[PDB]
């Protein structure tokens with residue numbers, strides 16, 4: 092039925108939006124297509140780990156997959172599974188696979204927790220219509236506080252076997268003149284210490300992250316969404332996927348919403364209507380809803396910019412083979428702590444996460460997730476035949492990202508006399524994974540598909556809140572930027588529209 096505000100999804104944009112709506116007294120319903128992850132499974136844990144994947148690992152696939160970079164060591168643990176409403180969805184497009192979370196909390200359930208503010212001068216370049224002073228003065232600090240960002244104890248970091256992998260890359264990078272930075276996180280680093288001491292159940296130190304963390308990680312269900320529920324004005328319905336959006340004849344918006352079980356069986360189709368409609372379905376999900384609505388004629392006044400301007404945050408994965416005297420360790424925390432910041436806003440810019448690997452024995456490999464500045468963009472194009480958005484991105488559009496990553500890591504290899512690994516990303520020789528994305532950005536870009544606060548052009552009381560707003564790149568891990576921009580946007584929307 093009717094409810095004043097509906098929020099589609101429960102990731103970062105959605106969670107911020109719902110909390111502030113509820114605090115403003117607006118009764119709000121959040122619709123999430125995945126599960127509320129709170130039921131102990133067959134091992135007594137909510138989530139499966141990376142060395143024991145099961146159906147919970149995967150959104151409707153029939154076989155588990157190894158985390159990218161890890162196939163050579165983790166294919167042995169893969170198994171056939173029944174298609175199930177699991178937590179991590181590998182979404183396959185023509186020449187790009189985008190990985191997204193599915194559940195109450197969205198990507199916050201599956202991500203590495205890295206909570207980083209973009210460089211102000213880069214923010215100013217990518218979003219020149221946005222007042223950067225309020226972002227840096229007000230909204231970024233608010234986001235970091237609410238998200239419960241915290242910082243690793245450097246003495247513990249320096250001492251612990253669980254971060255040897257990070258220290259090895261730091262030393263190697265330093266021989267090339269390259270520096271590292273500590274990366275703040277939403278994973279409780281005090282908890283992580285006690286894990287190493289054998290004092291509390293392990294999660295990051297038990298090879299968990301990408302299928303969820305049973306402990307330690309402050310995903311959005313614990314932070315913004317808990318607070319939203321606490322207002323008394325917000326509820327969350329799960330296993331509810333919004334399919335269509337239209338503008339009702341008498342005002343407001345109406346949604347068709349499918350309710351499924353965890354096996355994917357359709358239980359019901361419901362119409363839900365509202366006064367205020369907020370899209371927080373992610374870069375992929377929000378954009379799909381809007382291209383569908385435009386091209387099927389249910390939101391005919393959407394503009395041509397809906398679908399445009401997508402990029403993978405310049406994501407490239409690569410790996411180096413260490414010398415035999417530089418082992419990375421059998422025990423690697425699943426939460427990154429250091430990055431290589433070689434980001435100067437030029438086209439050679441790279442911000443690289445020093446990524447753990449989950450094998451649990453010594454491999455001598457250093458793994459990196461590079462974030463680059465690549466101007467190429469893709470477009471989501473509605474396919475009416477299959478009722479799907481398709482992402483028009485081709486692999487050659489990642490050549491600038493590969494080139495930037497390669498130039499940086501070539502400097503490190505030259506300084507150390509090391510070589511790449513070529514075998515971590517399939518049988519063909521391939522040192523740079525260039526057809527995945529963890530950080531999808533764009534599709535409904537701020538100021539192009541929307542006004543400067545995410546109001547969808549052509550419509551009143553229709554808002555986009557999430558990664559689809561970002562113009563393809565932020566130069567850092569994106570969730571803090573999504574969160575801060577959503578804080579800015581919803582405040583203003585409530586003040587002027589609600």
Ligand SMILES: Cc1cc2nc3c(=O)[nH]c(=O)nc-3n(C[C@H](O)[C@H](O)[C@H](O)COP(=O)(O)OP(=O)(O)OC[C@H]3O[C@@H](n4cnc5c(N)ncnc54)[C@H](O)[C@@H]3O)c2cc1C
Nearest residue numbers: 100102103104124197198203204205333376558568569570
């Ligand atoms: C492996 C991995 C590692 C990452 N590591 C980091 C990191 O360390 N730091 C960082 O900053 N970022 C990281 N990210 C990226 C980060 O998680 C995303 O940028 C962020 O979650 C995007 O937030 P969002 O609000 O746009 O959407 P999401 O968090 O993707 O949330 C969208 C939600 O909407 C739901 N949904 C979608 N369509 C519908 C629909 N039609 N109806 C109902 N519900 C719908 C989804 O199921 C989901 O719960 C990582 C991501 C992955 C996958």
